[PDB]
Amino acid sequence: MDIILGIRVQDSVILASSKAVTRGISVLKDSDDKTRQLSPHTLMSFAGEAGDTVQFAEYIQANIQLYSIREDYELSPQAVSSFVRQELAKSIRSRRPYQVNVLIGGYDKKKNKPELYQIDYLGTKVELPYGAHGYSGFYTFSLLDHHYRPDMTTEEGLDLLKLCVQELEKRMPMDFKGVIVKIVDKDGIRQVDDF
Amino acid sequence: MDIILGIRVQDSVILASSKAVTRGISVLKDSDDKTRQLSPHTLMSFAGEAGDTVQFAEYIQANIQLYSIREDYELSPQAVSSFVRQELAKSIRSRRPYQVNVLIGGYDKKKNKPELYQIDYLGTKVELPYGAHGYSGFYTFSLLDHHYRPDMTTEEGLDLLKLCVQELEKRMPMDFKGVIVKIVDKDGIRQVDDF
Amino acid sequence: QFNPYGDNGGTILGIAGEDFAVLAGDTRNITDYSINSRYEPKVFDCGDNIVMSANGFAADGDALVKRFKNSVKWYHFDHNDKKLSINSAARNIQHLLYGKRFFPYYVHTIIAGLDEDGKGAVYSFDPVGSYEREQCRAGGAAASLIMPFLDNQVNFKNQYEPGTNGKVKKPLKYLSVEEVIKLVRDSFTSATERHIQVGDGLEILIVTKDGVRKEFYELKRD
Amino acid sequence: TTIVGVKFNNGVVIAADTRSTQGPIVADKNCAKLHRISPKIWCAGAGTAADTEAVTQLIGSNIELHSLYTSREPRVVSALQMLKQHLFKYQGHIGAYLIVAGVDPTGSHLFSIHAHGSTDVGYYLSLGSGSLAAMAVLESHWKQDLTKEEAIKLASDAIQAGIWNDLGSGSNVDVCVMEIGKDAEYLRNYLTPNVREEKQKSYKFPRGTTAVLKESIVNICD
Amino acid sequence: TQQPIVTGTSVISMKYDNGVIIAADNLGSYGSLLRFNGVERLIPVGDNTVVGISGDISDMQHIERLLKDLVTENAYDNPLADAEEALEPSYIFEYLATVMYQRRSKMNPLWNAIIVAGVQSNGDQFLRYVNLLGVTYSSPTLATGFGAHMANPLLRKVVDRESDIPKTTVQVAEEAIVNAMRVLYYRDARSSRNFSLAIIDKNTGLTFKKNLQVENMKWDFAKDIKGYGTQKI
Amino acid sequence: GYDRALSIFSPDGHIFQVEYALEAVKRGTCAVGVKGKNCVVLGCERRSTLKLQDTRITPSKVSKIDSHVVLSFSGLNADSRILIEKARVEAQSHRLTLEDPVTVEYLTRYVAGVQQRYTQSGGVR
Amino acid sequence: TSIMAVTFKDGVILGADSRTTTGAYIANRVTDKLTRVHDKIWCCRSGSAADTQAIADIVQYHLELYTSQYGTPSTETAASVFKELCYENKDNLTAGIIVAGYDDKNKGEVYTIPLGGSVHKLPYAIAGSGSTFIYGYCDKNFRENMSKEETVDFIKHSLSQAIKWDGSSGGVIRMVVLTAAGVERLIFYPDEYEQL
Amino acid sequence: SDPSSINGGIVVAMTGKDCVAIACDLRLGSQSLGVSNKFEKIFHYGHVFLGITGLATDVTTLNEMFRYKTNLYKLKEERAIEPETFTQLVSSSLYERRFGPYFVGPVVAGINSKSGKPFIAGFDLIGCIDEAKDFIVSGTASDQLFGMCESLYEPNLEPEDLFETISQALLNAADRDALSGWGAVVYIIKKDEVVKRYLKMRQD
Amino acid sequence: TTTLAFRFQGGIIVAVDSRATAGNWVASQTVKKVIEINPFLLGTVAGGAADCQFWETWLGSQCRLHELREKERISVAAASKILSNLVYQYKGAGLSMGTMICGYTRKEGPTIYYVDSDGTRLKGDIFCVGSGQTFAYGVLDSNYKWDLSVEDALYLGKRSILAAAHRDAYSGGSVNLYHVTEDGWIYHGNHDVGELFWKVKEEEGSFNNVIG
Numbered sequence A, B: 001m002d003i004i005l006g007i008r009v010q011d012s013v014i015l016a017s018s019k020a021v022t023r024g025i026s027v028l029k030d031s032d033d034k035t036r037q038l039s040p041h042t043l044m045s046f047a048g049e050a051g052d053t054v055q056f057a058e059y060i061q062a063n064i065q066l067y068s069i070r071e072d073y074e075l076s077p078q079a080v081s082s083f084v085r086q087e088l089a090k091s092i093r094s095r096r097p098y099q100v101n102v103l104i105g106g107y108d109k110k111k112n113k114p115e116l117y118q119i120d121y122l123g124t125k126v127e128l129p130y131g132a133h134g135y136s137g138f139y140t141f142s143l144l145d146h147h148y149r150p151d152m153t154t155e156e157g158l159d160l161l162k163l164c165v166q167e168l169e170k171r172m173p174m175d176f177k178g179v180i181v182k183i184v185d186k187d188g189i190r191q192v193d194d195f
Numbered sequence C: 001q002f003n004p005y006g007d008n009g010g011t012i013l014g015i016a017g018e019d020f021a022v023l024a025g026d027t028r029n030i031t032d033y034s035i036n037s038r039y040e041p042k043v044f045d046c047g048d049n050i051v052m053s054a055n056g057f058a059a060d061g062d063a064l065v066k067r068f069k070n071s072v073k074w075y076h077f078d079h080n081d082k083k084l085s086i087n088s089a090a091r092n093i094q095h096l097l098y099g100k101r102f103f104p105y106y107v108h109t110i111i112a113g114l115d116e117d118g119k120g121a122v123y124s125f126d127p128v129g130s131y132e133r134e135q136c137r138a139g140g141a142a143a144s145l146i147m148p149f150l151d152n153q154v155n156f157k158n159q160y161e162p163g164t165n166g167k168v169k170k171p172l173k174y175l176s177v178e179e180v181i182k183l184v185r186d187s188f189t190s191a192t193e194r195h196i197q198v199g200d201g202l203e204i205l206i207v208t209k210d211g212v213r214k215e216f217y218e219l220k221r222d
Numbered sequence D: 001t002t003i004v005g006v007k008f009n010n011g012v013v014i015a016a017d018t019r020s021t022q023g024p025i026v027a028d029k030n031c032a033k034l035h036r037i038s039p040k041i042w043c044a045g046a047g048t049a050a051d052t053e054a055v056t057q058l059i060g061s062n063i064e065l066h067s068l069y070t071s072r073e074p075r076v077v078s079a080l081q082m083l084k085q086h087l088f089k090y091q092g093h094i095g096a097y098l099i100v101a102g103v104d105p106t107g108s109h110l111f112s113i114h115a116h117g118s119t120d121v122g123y124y125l126s127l128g129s130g131s132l133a134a135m136a137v138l139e140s141h142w143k144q145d146l147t148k149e150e151a152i153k154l155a156s157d158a159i160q161a162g163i164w165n166d167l168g169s170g171s172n173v174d175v176c177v178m179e180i181g182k183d184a185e186y187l188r189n190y191l192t193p194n195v196r197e198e199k200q201k202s203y204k205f206p207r208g209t210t211a212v213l214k215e216s217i218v219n220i221c222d
Numbered sequence E: 001t002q003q004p005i006v007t008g009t010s011v012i013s014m015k016y017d018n019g020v021i022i023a024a025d026n027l028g029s030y031g032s033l034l035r036f037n038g039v040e041r042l043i044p045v046g047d048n049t050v051v052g053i054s055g056d057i058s059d060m061q062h063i064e065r066l067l068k069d070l071v072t073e074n075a076y077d078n079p080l081a082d083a084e085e086a087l088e089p090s091y092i093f094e095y096l097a098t099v100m101y102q103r104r105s106k107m108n109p110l111w112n113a114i115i116v117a118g119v120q121s122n123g124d125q126f127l128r129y130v131n132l133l134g135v136t137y138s139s140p141t142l143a144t145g146f147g148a149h150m151a152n153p154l155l156r157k158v159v160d161r162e163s164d165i166p167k168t169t170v171q172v173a174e175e176a177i178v179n180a181m182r183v184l185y186y187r188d189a190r191s192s193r194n195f196s197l198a199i200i201d202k203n204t205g206l207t208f209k210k211n212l213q214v215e216n217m218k219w220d221f222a223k224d225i226k227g228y229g230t231q232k233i
Numbered sequence F: 001g002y003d004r005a006l007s008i009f010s011p012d013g014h015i016f017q018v019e020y021a022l023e024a025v026k027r028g029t030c031a032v033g034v035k036g037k038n039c040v041v042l043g044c045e046r047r048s049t050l051k052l053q054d055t056r057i058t059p060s061k062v063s064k065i066d067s068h069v070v071l072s073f074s075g076l077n078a079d080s081r082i083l084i085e086k087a088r089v090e091a092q093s094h095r096l097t098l099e100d101p102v103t104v105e106y107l108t109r110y111v112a113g114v115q116q117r118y119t120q121s122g123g124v125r
Numbered sequence G: 001t002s003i004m005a006v007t008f009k010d011g012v013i014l015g016a017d018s019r020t021t022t023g024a025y026i027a028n029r030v031t032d033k034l035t036r037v038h039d040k041i042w043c044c045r046s047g048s049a050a051d052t053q054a055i056a057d058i059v060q061y062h063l064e065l066y067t068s069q070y071g072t073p074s075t076e077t078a079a080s081v082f083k084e085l086c087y088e089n090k091d092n093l094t095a096g097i098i099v100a101g102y103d104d105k106n107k108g109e110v111y112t113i114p115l116g117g118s119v120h121k122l123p124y125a126i127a128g129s130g131s132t133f134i135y136g137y138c139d140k141n142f143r144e145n146m147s148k149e150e151t152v153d154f155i156k157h158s159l160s161q162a163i164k165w166d167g168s169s170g171g172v173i174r175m176v177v178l179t180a181a182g183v184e185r186l187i188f189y190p191d192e193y194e195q196l
Numbered sequence H: 001s002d003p004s005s006i007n008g009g010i011v012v013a014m015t016g017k018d019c020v021a022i023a024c025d026l027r028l029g030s031q032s033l034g035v036s037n038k039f040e041k042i043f044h045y046g047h048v049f050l051g052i053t054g055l056a057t058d059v060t061t062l063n064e065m066f067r068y069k070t071n072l073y074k075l076k077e078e079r080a081i082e083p084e085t086f087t088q089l090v091s092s093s094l095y096e097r098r099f100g101p102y103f104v105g106p107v108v109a110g111i112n113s114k115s116g117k118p119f120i121a122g123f124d125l126i127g128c129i130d131e132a133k134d135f136i137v138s139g140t141a142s143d144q145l146f147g148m149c150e151s152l153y154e155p156n157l158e159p160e161d162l163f164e165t166i167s168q169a170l171l172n173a174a175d176r177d178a179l180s181g182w183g184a185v186v187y188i189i190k191k192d193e194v195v196k197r198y199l200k201m202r203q204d
Numbered sequence I: 001t002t003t004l005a006f007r008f009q010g011g012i013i014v015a016v017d018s019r020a021t022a023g024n025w026v027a028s029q030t031v032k033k034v035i036e037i038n039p040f041l042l043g044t045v046a047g048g049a050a051d052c053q054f055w056e057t058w059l060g061s062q063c064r065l066h067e068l069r070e071k072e073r074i075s076v077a078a079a080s081k082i083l084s085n086l087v088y089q090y091k092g093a094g095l096s097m098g099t100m101i102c103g104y105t106r107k108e109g110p111t112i113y114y115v116d117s118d119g120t121r122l123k124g125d126i127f128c129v130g131s132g133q134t135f136a137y138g139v140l141d142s143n144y145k146w147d148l149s150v151e152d153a154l155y156l157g158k159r160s161i162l163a164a165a166h167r168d169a170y171s172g173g174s175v176n177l178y179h180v181t182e183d184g185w186i187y188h189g190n191h192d193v194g195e196l197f198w199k200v201k202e203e204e205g206s207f208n209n210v211i212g
């Protein structure tokens, strides 16, 4: 767990998440998917403390899927992000808090708009055009401040994302073994296999 | 400073040293040469605490060069390694010790034999067929235990070295930005430009 | 601040034969540099041809033995007086020990007896319950002195056949009860010489199909 | 350690056990704790083994040079003064606890010195880990106007109390008698009540048991 | 988690041919202050057991109440309370040992060292130790605190092993105990001259001696001792 | 807490409360299940004494427990919601721990187990 | 320790117990805490045995060298030398010293030197762990210009109580009498003073 | 960060009938990592043998130091240093660094050339001499070696028998210690011949 | 400890050492670090001996209860998740466990799951766990191919443990081999390093650092 990025463009949300899983002086895995599909048009990437991350992600996934079955209806990305925030807001004052930071990328079908939410382990939620957790932000935010435009296409967003990954691969101390990129739009969620 | 390796083969000593110089969350340089030529047939690679490493390497280099001028004669790798060990052995009980680990690869012209010495910051010297400092050893030693043969050529040694770098690039957590490889033999010291 | 643990010293030793097993232990009980008792037994007959010793912190040792003895009693009540096999006893002890995983019994436990094929058995436990059947085990203060000697003399480690160029190992064989008791006595006299917490007396419990026999020997009292 | 000193009619006697420890391990079973400062001034040492040996030799050396300078036999108070001032200077970091005794032109003397440089005078004294065991015996059996044979008995009894009851002390009893007008007699291993019993078995291996890889003659000559 | 406040020092004891002897001084120390001087630290239970307690006095008084209550509880619905079903030393000890270990296991110990001395119904001598940690052991001689370091060596010269017990009379055994108490008065900075001594014999029963004093002390040689090395005056 | 044993045996060996619960099922609207070679069909009756209904929002008789399992019923409508909710939760819990959706037999076994628990628990019918 | 020094009509008397401790163990039950720095200038030692001995040895050396050059030193001079050592090395010393001496001009004098290294001239002085328990008693019972027998009784009764209550004090009660007549050593054993 | 158990290693010495034996393992590691399997811990100056366990840099430093001092000794004295004298020199040199000591466990072994008496001795890190008739042990498996030697040893062993005893003492002690092993060397020392044998042991 | 297990053409190889340490004290050379859960499931153990042993022995009971209740052998995924969910409950309490759940089922095929005491659960083809994992990785990665034969794969797993047993001070004793196929696990013997090292050195010509 280290690098998770998010970029909201005109018609979609793009999430990039690093593939490396390290413990000690060994990279145990280089093909790890740090994300779960909460609903057909909502995707959550995650990063933080070992064990906590997946346990939390799947717990949220289960709750959202339960809601979908009960109401035969998909929750809006805004509604999901508010639910997730509250869970983390409870967590932080628990005996043992979830040390998990997340990005929630979703496509609101009622508004026909992509939405990207950044929530830290304290339960601090913000809607953003582009987001990142951990040390990634220290490079990507300034880069996106410069190159990002609000009316960009998905293809332009992927090129913008390639520019971030290249910078991280150049200046980051740790080898994060590339990223898995996923796109969230009106047609749902799909994975870019060649990045 | 992180990865320094050494492999003594039939007719030469091969030193591989990582190019990355990191501080904090930034790779400041990716083309750093972590070695100094002590004499025409003796090369010392180094790794450890920032500042100490180069300060120590150059101090040794100066002393050996001074000896060469005074006597119009090149010290043997064994003699140089003993001098270096004593300096570190003094250092460890100083007010502020040099936190520097070194490998000394050399070609003894009188014996017509390559020699590789591994010396840590405490002044612990050992002659070896292959050596490493830091976390590198935890991967490379077992690998070399398997693949190394004493009668190998320089070309076979470079392939053996490529096998080490590949393993380190696969399993090491940090990005060390490849290695600069140098060969020490009867004709002196030369650098492999394409690795 | 109150420290709930203490070190009562002493050392124990278990060796298994073909149709027997011994569990020995010195009778000295200490705290710091003082002797509390020159004869305080810590090797106990627990019934069903099982002998047990829990060396280390005596209070925890006595508690454990007391609880296992009680476990044997209730095993009879609940399962129609069935004999508790040594392998079943060992697993039961694991659960006793691990039950206090987060406030452990500070003891090295050893039990000895006969397995269900009638062959000698020795089991040893760490403080939190990991266990293993072995031919040989020393535990306690002087375990580090005795154990390598047992490797050499019981399991014939590092011993090769003369004149075979170190190619043929010395063949493993069971030892007689007479030969085992010699190794026990020599182990404890050696340990007494070089370890201050070991001495006073040696008590050996021998387990055969006939029952549990005892033997006592003097050790140096300095 | 256990060390004692006892005054009598025409002189003084000191004694010591012979155990040397390294944690709970007995490193030396027969080390000499009675040191010669001068021919008729002897010293029993407890605490850090290197320190007691080093500090006694240094003062013993300087006493010899002083004796040659002054053309006089050295005095116990001179050794006492030089030791305490040296030990005080190092603020207890030199862990030497000494019983200093001897005879000189002034008479017979008995003192103790502690690591921090404090000195005490007495007719009977005891230092070391087993000083309480020894002092119990001294307090029970000491009287004024002891003879030579009575003082040796009392001293060795006080050491024995340490040997048996203190885990820090053991093995043998060394004694040194310093009587006025006579040569001091150093009784090395005066008592040996801790002899190792015969081993049950000989562990002499058959020749060729150990596997060998290489042989070579080593050159010790020029 | 506790710290002891008002404390009692050594309790010493030994076996002899027909029974057991136990002793303890009458002091209740408050750190270096020798605060209370009328403290009884030997507590008889029935006519066949004496419990000697050292360490924290508040916890000692709690244990007194438990033993007092134990006698009451044993008498309930028990026609043989003063005969076959009377309290044995072994019953009293095991009870205390159970409590001591339960309390250490709850990290709230009774800050004491206890010696239960008595004679069983079959005439056998009982002498066993238990402390704040729940640690138990038995020996021909037992002692707590400074007693362990100074008394035991002296008492072991009389009874060094099991076979020496029948050879030791009550006269010899008491003499050794009284001597040990004197040595402790010389050398233990938290001890007093006044003490109590109890003898539990299988024939003559329980003899409880109060208001004893250490006597026949050697102090005269002190006048000859001058300075700390050189000084002659 | 209310402890009363409501479901109990009678002299003839019957639990009347369980049998009277079956009468409530017999009162309920008809439901039918027919399984073919490659499909299952769930048919359900809806009584026509209720006109002026809003069929968009009125609770449907067939309920999805998961994306692959459905549950229809006959009897008390309010009671059915409790079973459906429990079944839906268990369906998600099974996916979470076993990493695989429930079998139809498993989901049935769970629902049936809930129904049984209410036949020998105090305070409940 | 329990120590005290008391001036009286004919001169001054020093008093002390004889107990030395390591924790609760009594290392020496017959200690001599009254020590000579000059013919008729003595001191009572409390605190670290090593420190007080080292100090007293140095003072004795200084006063011996003083006497060789300038003749007999005053009691004030001795107290000044003690002070100089205790004050300048206050960080490394644990020594509570009472200096007492007899001049023919100045008669009996008592100076006390606590941990800090300050000097205090007094009619009488008490110090050491066991002194705390006898402040009340000594204040109520002390009178100036007492006789020798009265001063001996005052010290004996005082130290008896200090010993009775302080665990760190005990053994024999040593005393040293300083008058024009000379130097007299007195000793009093438990059997006498305990039952006062 | 315990200097005496970073590199690991062991040395053991024994006396026999008109002979002495000294033996050591070959491991040099950095905690868990094994680095060298050729690191010998026994040196010799003339006929006097010195084994040194502990921190490897100090093992090397002290060897070089005692080579230095014995060479000057021989030039001035015009004779080789004897084991009894060398023992005192080691003690002096170690205690000189009392408050900044070499983290070592040295072991002297040899035969006095004049008297012919077998001699062995051991030291703590600050130079306290531990003389012994029977045996001396040192290193990370000292407890193990003490246990092996105390049981296996018997007096007046012949050189060929003494070899088997010391070798079995070292091997079985080393196998119960994680930081010791990786090969072993045994020196058998007679009055005027010395045999050096490399032992075959398990390489884990 | 050193333990590994890798996936390949012919199923799964699992290899472990047998050493147990208490600090630098070598406590045992004959510990069984492969737990046989059922004929189709294996579990490797590394870390705290009692924690691993107790809880993987407990895991086998939970897997038995599954097949009684469900009339079907538990999946490798479900088995590993029972253990990972268990240790996650004890997170922060100080459990020390590095385990690998290896096995075959019809729906999954050959599968390996890495599970550790801080709650990490990872599916993968190759894993090495323990104090000597890096030493095993070095040999294993540099010689690994998917198309290895059963004979070559068994040897590589054995050789990788040997490599770690040699270099890692806290690994050794003997090598325990296992091979997991569609028909279940197959034991391939206990191999003492005492004999295996010299046998491998001579035949392979490797370990030239050591004095032959």
Ligand SMILES: *[C@@](C)(CO)[C@](*)(O)[C@H](CC(C)C)NC(=O)[C@H](Cc1ccccc1)NC(=O)[C@H](CC(C)C)NC(=O)[C@H](CCc1ccccc1)NC(=O)CN1CCOCC1
Binding pocket: D001, D002, D019, D020, D021, D022, D023, D027, D028, D031, D033, D045, D046, D047, D048, D049, D050, D052, D095, D128, D129, D168, D169, H004, H054, H103, H104, H105, H123, H124, H125, H126, H128, H129, H130
């Ligand atoms: C009784 C026997 C006390 O038990 C006596 O008081 C004797 C005194 C006699 C021998 C003169 N005391 C000892 O034997 C003494 C006990 C001791 C131990 C440690 C500190 C103080 C006192 N033992 C020693 O001094 C041994 C002598 C050996 C056996 C030859 N030395 C050690 O134990 C040294 C301690 C050195 C030391 C350094 C700095 C301050 C104080 C002491 N310890 C080691 O060598 C342990 N370790 C071995 C591996 O290398 C790292 C150090």
Ligand SMILES: *[C@@](C)(CO)[C@](*)(O)[C@H](CC(C)C)NC(=O)[C@H](Cc1ccccc1)NC(=O)[C@H](CC(C)C)NC(=O)[C@H](CCc1ccccc1)NC(=O)CN1CCOCC1
Binding pocket: D114, D116, D118, G001, G002, G019, G020, G021, G022, G023, G027, G031, G033, G045, G046, G047, G048, G049, G050, G052, G094, G128, G129, G168, G169
């Ligand atoms: C009464 C008793 C208290 O005020 C008197 O003042 C006497 C004065 C006389 C002796 C001149 N004081 C003592 O007896 C004095 C009390 C004391 C203790 C510690 C610091 C200051 C004062 N006792 C000592 O000085 C003893 C004398 C020895 C035993 C002969 N020394 C110790 O107790 C040493 C002192 C170490 C020390 C510490 C700080 C400064 C100087 C010296 N302590 C130990 O050895 C500690 N010991 C280690 C083993 O575990 C038990 C404690």
Ligand SMILES: *[C@@](C)(CO)[C@](*)(O)[C@H](CC(C)C)NC(=O)[C@H](Cc1ccccc1)NC(=O)[C@H](CC(C)C)NC(=O)[C@H](CCc1ccccc1)NC(=O)CN1CCOCC1
Binding pocket: C101, C104, C126, C127, C128, C130, I001, I002, I019, I020, I021, I022, I023, I025, I027, I028, I031, I033, I045, I046, I047, I048, I049, I050, I052, I096, I130, I131, I170, I171
């Ligand atoms: C390699 C060898 C090292 O990592 C492996 O990982 C093996 C795994 C095998 C055994 C399954 N691990 C160990 O050998 C493991 C290392 C370890 C130790 C302690 C904590 C974590 C990891 N060793 C143990 O678990 C040993 C096994 C015994 C010796 C058979 N056990 C102990 O060290 C025990 C229990 C430790 C403990 C854990 C949790 C709570 C309390 C205690 N401790 C002791 O026996 C204490 N000690 C032994 C020496 O004598 C004094 C007392």
Ligand SMILES: [Cl-]
Binding pocket: D119, E228, G031, G032, G033, G049, G053
């Ligand atoms: Cl003093």
Ligand SMILES: [Mg+2]
Binding pocket: G163, G164, G165, G166, G167, G168, G169, G170
């Ligand atoms: Mg008093």
Ligand SMILES: [Mg+2]
Binding pocket: H174, H175, H176, H177, H178, H179, H180, H181, H182, H204
């Ligand atoms: Mg080993």
Ligand SMILES: [Mg+2]
Binding pocket: H203, H204, I164, I165, I166, I167, I168, I169, I170, I171, I172
């Ligand atoms: Mg190993």
